[PDB]
Amino acid sequence: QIPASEQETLVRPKPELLKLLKSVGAQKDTYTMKEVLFYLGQYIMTKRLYDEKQQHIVYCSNDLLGDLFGVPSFSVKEHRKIYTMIYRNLVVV
Ligand SMILES: Cc1cccc(-c2nc(C(=O)O)c(-c3cccc(Cl)c3)n2-c2cc(Cl)ccc2C)c1
Hints:
The structure is a monomer. The chain has helices at residues 4-7, 15-22, 33-46, 64-69, 79-87; strands at 10-13, 31-32, 57-59, 73-75, 90-92. It is of the alpha+beta class. The chain has one domain: Orthogonal Bundle (MDM2), CATH 1.10.245. The ligand Cc1cccc(-c2nc(C(=O)O)c(-c3cccc(Cl)c3)n2-c2cc(Cl)ccc2C)c1 binds next to helix 3 and helix 5. The site of the ligand Cc1cccc(-c2nc(C(=O)O)c(-c3cccc(Cl)c3)n2-c2cc(Cl)ccc2C)c1 has 12 residues, from helix 3 and helix 5. Residues 1-93 are annotated as: Necessary for interaction with USP2. Belongs to the MDM2/MDM4 family. Residues 9-92 form the SWIB/MDM2 domain.
């Protein structure tokens, strides 16, 4: 969906995103957009933030993810919206 070169962007997470990344096994200061996404996805799976019936819907209010994204819920299919929500929380290198 999102172009591969955008997927390959080297990025440095701001402290709060780094913190969520590191609670799901992350061990570095510098990441590609791809690695950020994997780890955020692992967070969502571990914490079971998805709707049982419609599993592409995520609920993230009163949660670190909520703090980062600025929305209470979203569909995981709207990639451009997710990328926009991610970009707020990092520095492109
Ligand atoms: C319910 C749940 C748990 C874990 C991952 C996902 C899930 N399913 C898909 C998908 O595309 O089908 C995606 C996805 C993949 C590539 C880019 C973007 Cl922006 C999102 N994700 C996904 C969603 C978020 Cl918010 C963060 C990371 C991933 C990997 C959904």
